[PDB]
Design a protein around this ligand. Structure first.
Ligand SMILES: C=C(C)[C@H]1CN[C@H](C(=O)O)[C@H]1CC(=O)O
Ligand SMILES: C=C(C)[C@H]1CN[C@H](C(=O)O)[C@H]1CC(=O)O
Lengths: 246, 248
């Protein structure tokens, strides 16, 4: 039996709503749960789903790793199945399957302003902007030497206290209730904009990355999961699953 | 010193044009060459570029189970890396390893502008307009393996007309499109290069699937995750994007 570490994030993983109380794996549904189930069928493993205790994805603080990334490092889990960005920093410490979805950083804002691009935000200060603290998105800006993104980070880091948030939900509410643009992942933006008609992605994608299944470094499951993902992708299951949940 | 297998394909890999004949790695330029050089700098390896002898990418001979092309080179440890527009596929992954993708693309349709043909389904449900792909390439293999109804049907068509509608290069496919009533199934990245250069050609519909190109290594090779890590760095600092801009 595999321990599968995950995190609450709609529509990837959520508590299934029902009257009768649900137990163990039944409690969960979502794109990632469907994925996990499809993988389980192809590969022939059983599993226990567990929500990462510290509720973090995985960042380096003292140099300590946290979240689902730490769980894999310490062998406290076999797989991480969540919207976990495949990144340089994470890849040095864990392994990732080939990506099951592709995405990019982009901007969440209200409809019908003059704001048209990242550069439009960067060259002003009236409209505040930020991102989830210590997430892949934030780290991209923190490390970027592209001139526009450098400026944005200078803005964000200096207003760290007030513009950086602890979740996508927190960021979304900010956008809805104040003059604020949220830097978030395009896949999540798409879900949100379908459900709030007054909101909209601004500009295009700022970068490119994927979500992958995480495994402890050197794990034999890696390429097995990779092969499974490619199979699923080519036969259009991954696509149906996106269509289902979006 | 690493042995790097590759193949001539614009704008990924090409012979540098010059009066004086050039030697070794100097002979080559392109997106993939730039990539290889950037990887070499990050990882600190030296290398020798070699064009794959049989001039194939990699399919399994379905009579005798022999692999060919760059995939075969890696399997046999005749090379350390394959750097080319080598699609990361289910069948190939079972026999070699791939880095994380340096480019994302998908199968699409190259056709002439301003017909009623709008999708793969439109092609599949007729026979007047012929269609095909590079023989034994990733695109053909996708249709050959697909259980999607429309694609299954397309493969029935193609395989039975194997004689005449499957081609040996992108270039051959393109000439076909230009000079007869034919739609060419090819990779979207290549479509884009081509359409920028022939003003009467266009992409029909959207992407039929999604895949990446990755650097190939022999299974269990340690180079894998090193190269992957290098690719993620290059992707995150926007160098991969600049490189595409440069060559397109
Ligand atoms: C905090 C969110 C939910 C996570 C999700 N994926 C990204 C990650 O892998 O860290 C983060 C998005 C972001 O940083 O904007
Ligand atoms: C025969 C072309 C040039 C190659 C290139 N990449 C794909 C591959 O990795 O096989 C093939 C495209 C295709 O099959 O349409």
């Amino acid at each position: 039996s595999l321990i599968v570490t995950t995190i609450l994030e709609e529509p990837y993983v959520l508590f299934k709503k029902s009257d009768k109380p649900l137990y163990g794996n039944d409690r969960f549904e979502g794109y990632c749960i469907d994925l996990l189930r499809e993988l389980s069928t192809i590969l022939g493993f059983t599993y226990e789903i567990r929500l990462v205790e510290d509720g973090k994805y995985g960042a380096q603080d003292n140099g300590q790793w946290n979240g689902m990334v730490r769980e894999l490092i310490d062998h406290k889990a076999d797989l991480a199945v969540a919207p976990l960005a495949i990144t340089y920093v994470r890849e040095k410490v864990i392994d990732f399957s080939a990506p099951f979805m592709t995405l990019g950083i982009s901007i969440l804002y209200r409809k019908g302003t003059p704001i048209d691009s990242a550069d439009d935000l960067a060259k002003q200060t009236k409209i505040e902007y930020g991102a989830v603290e210590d997430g892949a998105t934030m780290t991209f800006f923190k490390k970027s030497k592209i001139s526009t993104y450098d400026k944005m980070w200078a803005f964000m880091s200096s207003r760290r206290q007030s513009v950086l948030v602890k979740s996508n939900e927190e960021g979304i509410q900010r956008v809805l209730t104040s003059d604020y643009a949220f830097l978030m992942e395009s896949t999540t933006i798409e879900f949100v904009t379908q459900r709030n008609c007054n909101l909209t992605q601004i500009g295009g994608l700022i970068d490119s990355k994927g979500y992958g299944v995480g495994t402890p470094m050197g794990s034999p499951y890696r390429d097995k999961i990779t092969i499974a993902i490619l199979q699923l992708q080519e036969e259009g299951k991954l696509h149906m699953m996106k269509e289902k949940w979006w």
